[PDB]
Symmetry: C2
Subunit: 153 residues, 2 copies
Amino acid sequence: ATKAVCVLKGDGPVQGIINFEQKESNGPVKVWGSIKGVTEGLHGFHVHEFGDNTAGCTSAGPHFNPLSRKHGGPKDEERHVGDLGNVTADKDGVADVSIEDSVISLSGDHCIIGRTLVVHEKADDLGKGGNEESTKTGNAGSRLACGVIGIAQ
Amino acid sequence: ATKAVCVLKGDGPVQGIINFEQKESNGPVKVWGSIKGVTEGLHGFHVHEFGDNTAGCTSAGPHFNPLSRKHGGPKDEERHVGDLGNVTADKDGVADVSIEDSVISLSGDHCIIGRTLVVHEKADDLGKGGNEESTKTGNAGSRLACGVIGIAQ
Ligand SMILES: [Cl-]
Ligand SMILES: [Cl-]
Ligand SMILES: [Cu+2]
Ligand SMILES: [Cu+2]
Ligand SMILES: [Zn+2]
Ligand SMILES: [Zn+2]
């Protein structure tokens, strides 16, 4: 299988390790791991275009959107390639991440390797929020931690 | 694509930002930037196989070596793809990096996107030391700082 990994860090207490595995060419990508230091509830979770952390998470730019679509949720046909929805933290501030997605890839034009994974302050409204930002960013707010997605063994 | 970036970090603090640019896929990659916090003199400088920083720089594994060749200097035919030689720090502990390399790439099978850039404790002996490690690691010693190479705007 092809594999990738991302270490999430930021300016505050949020940190985690996220794994990716794609067993078959153009097949589903399994995304799993854990994030700690976040508030209980849902937090937006996306791949952003640039693997640039020079000024922290802001340097990663907008959502990864090679097909020029509107923002949505991962279950929607209308979404950015990088739109992985929300992750959910428990009362301890720990989110167990377990996603399977077939729009991201670990090769080709939808490849996410070398791009940035970002966990946000607020929930992503999945494009359902009724204001213009909703179909751009999902209103997920500030970037609490990020990392560059790297090739894994 | 045509640009990449890497934020190097390690204990010291050792800190740097390294940029990569490739005009066309059949051309060389320019590698430039600055590294601070290291001892005066030459330090080994390589792309390692994995973009995995989970336990720091050790997690990046061996030099990026898709052809299974021996370790060398950047000028040599017999080298690893990731063998970028040495960078040189001044009395103030700052290295100004300025390399052009024809073997690394920002696309294709020698693509370094999603891999780890590492600066070392010691100089790289370019495979011309007397010992068996010379033609594996160049005897560059510990890993002072690293980061994952990301796609840049
Ligand atoms: Cl959802
Ligand atoms: Cl040299
Ligand atoms: Cu995001
Ligand atoms: Cu090295
Ligand atoms: Zn989006
Ligand atoms: Zn080498």
